[PDB]
Amino acid sequence: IVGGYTCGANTVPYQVSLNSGYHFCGGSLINSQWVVSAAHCYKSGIQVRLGEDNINVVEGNEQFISASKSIVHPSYNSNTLNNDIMLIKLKSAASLNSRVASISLPTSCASAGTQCLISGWGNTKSSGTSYPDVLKCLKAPILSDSSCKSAYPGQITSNMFCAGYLEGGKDSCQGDSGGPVVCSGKLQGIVSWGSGCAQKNKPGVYTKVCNYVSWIKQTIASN
Numbered sequence: 001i002v003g004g005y006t007c008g009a010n011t012v013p014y015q016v017s018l019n020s021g022y023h024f025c026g027g028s029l030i031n032s033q034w035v036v037s038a039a040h041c042y043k044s045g046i047q048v049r050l051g052e053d054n055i056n057v058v059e060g061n062e063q064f065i066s067a068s069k070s071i072v073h074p075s076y077n078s079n080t081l082n083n084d085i086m087l088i089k090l091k092s093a094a095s096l097n098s099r100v101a102s103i104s105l106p107t108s109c110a111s112a113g114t115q116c117l118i119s120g121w122g123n124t125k126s127s128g129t130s131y132p133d134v135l136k137c138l139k140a141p142i143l144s145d146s147s148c149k150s151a152y153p154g155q156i157t158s159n160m161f162c163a164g165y166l167e168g169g170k171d172s173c174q175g176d177s178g179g180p181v182v183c184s185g186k187l188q189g190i191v192s193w194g195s196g197c198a199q200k201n202k203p204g205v206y207t208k209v210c211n212y213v214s215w216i217k218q219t220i221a222s223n
């Protein structure tokens, strides 16, 4: 996350860290047994880490659980990143508390203008590499699809939306990947892609989760 701030320990209780021997992506807990993340974060051998803040220090509120199954969206296009969402099932159900909580899926999609919270342990330098050990937050509004499409002509579909600052400076970045974008209490986006990070006129692109609620509910009930 570039131009963000330190969230604070366990202030984003639904945030997860996907670890395959090191943190590689983020994700969101949707109930005690399932996590939603991005399909471009797909790997085999994933361990989910809940209650994290400093991912390099066992501070006491973590739960480390292995994934029993991963389901990448059936129409995921790795070339365009259209339908960039995946579901991970845990081997054991997590114990939810103040520090580990699930986030609610939306009833409707959110409007442009709406401010959201995005978080992750991803890169924090636009030009450089600096990876943080504690969770970083960023508040950004959803941009109109018009400015999104102008920034990325012929690359945006109806399953994506942009959020950010066209002036540059603030953005999610690699590592934040799969992470949450919460606006008004609902999970509305998944950190998917961008052009570099925090570049002017190159806002972040997010998966539009409100278009996947029936797939998510049907998939978790039958698995």
Ligand SMILES: NC(=[NH2+])c1ccc2nc(C(O)(O)c3nc4ccc(C(N)=[NH2+])cc4[nH]3)[nH]c2c1
Pocket (backbone or CB within 6 Å): 023, 024, 025, 040, 041, 171, 172, 173, 174, 175, 176, 177, 191, 192, 193, 194, 195, 196, 197, 198, 203, 204, 205
């Ligand atoms: N080595 C790894 N473990 C790793 C993990 C995830 C990655 N994801 C990318 C990316 O290439 O897929 C990537 N994810 C992005 C998310 C947001 C923005 C943005 N808003 N500018 C840009 C991004 N680029 N590389 C990655 C490398």
Ligand SMILES: [Ca+2]
Pocket (backbone or CB within 6 Å): 052, 053, 054, 055, 056, 057, 058, 059, 060, 062
């Ligand atoms: Ca920790």
Ligand SMILES: [Mg+2]
Pocket (backbone or CB within 6 Å): 025, 026, 027, 119, 120, 121, 175, 176, 177, 178, 179, 180, 191
């Ligand atoms: Mg994240």
Ligand SMILES: [Zn+2]
Pocket (backbone or CB within 6 Å): 174
């Ligand atoms: Zn990359």
Ligand SMILES: [Zn+2]
Pocket (backbone or CB within 6 Å): 174, 194, 196
């Ligand atoms: Zn990238």
Ligand SMILES: [Zn+2]
Pocket (backbone or CB within 6 Å): 040, 173, 174, 175, 176, 177, 178, 192
């Ligand atoms: Zn990524």
